[PDB]
Structures are given as structure tokens and as C-alpha cells.
Structure 1
Amino acid sequence: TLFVALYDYEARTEDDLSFHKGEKFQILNSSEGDWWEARSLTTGETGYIPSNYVAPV
């Protein structure tokens, strides 16, 4: 159930994650629209990610 970043992303808002291509995530909440809550498996940080930037491993 791991997801992987297809692209780098630089987040400029408080609650959105920045991440690099290849970074791995666990999805915590996909129910609230097309920004998902996720945990980065690099940092352990939780925040929102754009769901079009990640794909299932």
C-alpha cells in the first residue's frame, strides 16, 4: 500500500508536504478531495499531498 512521488514538489503552504521524486508515502486519508493526507516515509511528517503526483508502488 506504499505510494511513490512521480515528481518533485515544493509546497509553500503550512499543511502541504514538499517532497522529491521517488519519495515513499503512506496515505492516511483520501476521502476529503484530491489532496490526500499522507506520511512521508523519509521524514515521518504528515501533511497534504496532491494526489496526481503519486502512484502506487
Structure 2
Amino acid sequence: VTLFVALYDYEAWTEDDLSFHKGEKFQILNSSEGDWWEARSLTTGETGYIPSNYVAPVD
């Protein structure tokens, strides 16, 4: 924790971004770039950039 949940599906298109689906949860490893955050998915066990407007905090 702190854990975020994916609100929508996202398909990667660059080299550092991560593909994910509605409902995957993430550990945010690095959140200092406003729009793009470094995450690890607790579902697929994978690491890469995700867009921040595509996740919400878990609660």
C-alpha cells in the first residue's frame, strides 16, 4: 500500500508503458511525473508507466 485500482482498460504503445485491464491493482513505485506514474501490477506482476487518470486509490 498505497494501492490503486485500474478504472479502465489501457493498451500499451510505447516501450516503458504497461498494458492493464479494468480492475487490476497497482503498487505505485514512482509518482512524480504528474500524468505518467511507475507502477507494478499485483495481477500480472509487471512494471512500467501507467497514466494517472486511469487509476483511483483503492479505499
TM-score of the two chains, using structure 1 as the length reference: 0.93
Q: Distance in 1 between matches of 2:33 and 2:3?
A: 19
What RMSD in Å do the two structures reach over aligned CA positions? 0.8
Show the 5 A alignment for 1:1-57. Answer: 1-57=2-58
Deviation at 1:30, TM superposition (A): 0.6
User: C-alpha distance in 2, partners of 1:32/1:55?
Assistant: 16
Query: Please, which runs of 5 or more residues in structure 2 have no aligned partner?
Result: none
Kindly tell me the number of residue pairs found equivalent between the two proteins: 57
Q: Distance in 2 between matches of 1:24 and 1:4?
A: 4
Percent identical across equivalent pairs? Answer: 98
How far has the Cα of 1:43 moved from its partner? Answer: 1.6
List gaps (5 residues or longer) in structure 1: none
* 1:12 Cα deviation after fit: 1.2
* 1:29 Cα deviation from its structure 2 partner: 0.5
The structure richer in strand per residue is 2
TM-score (norm 2): 0.90
- SS at 1:11's partner residue? coil
